[PDB]
Amino acid sequence: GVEIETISPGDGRTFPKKGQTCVVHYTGMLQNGKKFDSSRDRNKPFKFRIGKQEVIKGFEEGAAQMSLGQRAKLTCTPDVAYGATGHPGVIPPNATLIFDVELLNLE
C-alpha cells in the first residue's frame, strides 16, 4: 500500500518509465521515531534506474507515481520493505516507513 500526498508544483507529466535513470533527493523518517536516512547529508542525490528491483518495493511504486519537480510523501507498509526481517540495526522488524521524496531527474 503506497499512499501518496504530493507537495504540488512541477509539471505533472514527465513520468518515470522502464530503462530510465532518475535522481531523487530522498529523506527517510521512522513513524513515531527519528530519522534514519537522508540523501541531503551526503549531497550525492542517488542516481538510480527503474526496473532492476534495486530499491525496496514501497519506494519503487511511489517513484513511478511522481513527475519532474514534484514532491511526494511515501507511506510504505511493513511487508513491502523490511517488516518480516528488518534491516539489521537500522530498521526494526515490523516497521512502517515514511519518506520525503522529491523527483528532480533526467532521461
Curated annotation (Swiss-Prot):
Cited PROSITE patterns: FKBP_PPIASE
Localization: Cytoplasm; Sarcoplasmic reticulum
The keyword S-adenosyl-L-methionine is annotated on this UniProt entry: no
Gene Ontology cellular-component annotations: calcium channel complex; cytoplasm; membrane; sarcoplasmic reticulum membrane; Z disc
Principal location: cytoplasm
Domain PPIase FKBP-type: 19-107
GO biological process: 'de novo' protein folding; calcium-mediated signaling; insulin secretion involved in cellular response to glucose stimulus; negative regulation of calcium-mediated signaling; negative regulation of heart rate; negative regulation of insulin secretion involved in cellular response to glucose stimulus; negative regulation of release of sequestered calcium ion into cytosol; neuronal action potential propagation
Keywords linked to the UniProt accession: Cytoplasm, Isomerase, Rotamase, Sarcoplasmic reticulum
Pfam families named in the record: FKBP_C
Function, as annotated: Has the potential to contribute to the immunosuppressive and toxic effects of FK506 and rapamycin. PPIases accelerate the folding of proteins. It catalyzes the cis-trans isomerization of proline imidic peptide bonds in oligopeptides.
Protein name: Peptidyl-prolyl cis-trans isomerase FKBP1B
Gene source species: Homo sapiens (Human)
Gene responsible for this protein: FKBP1B
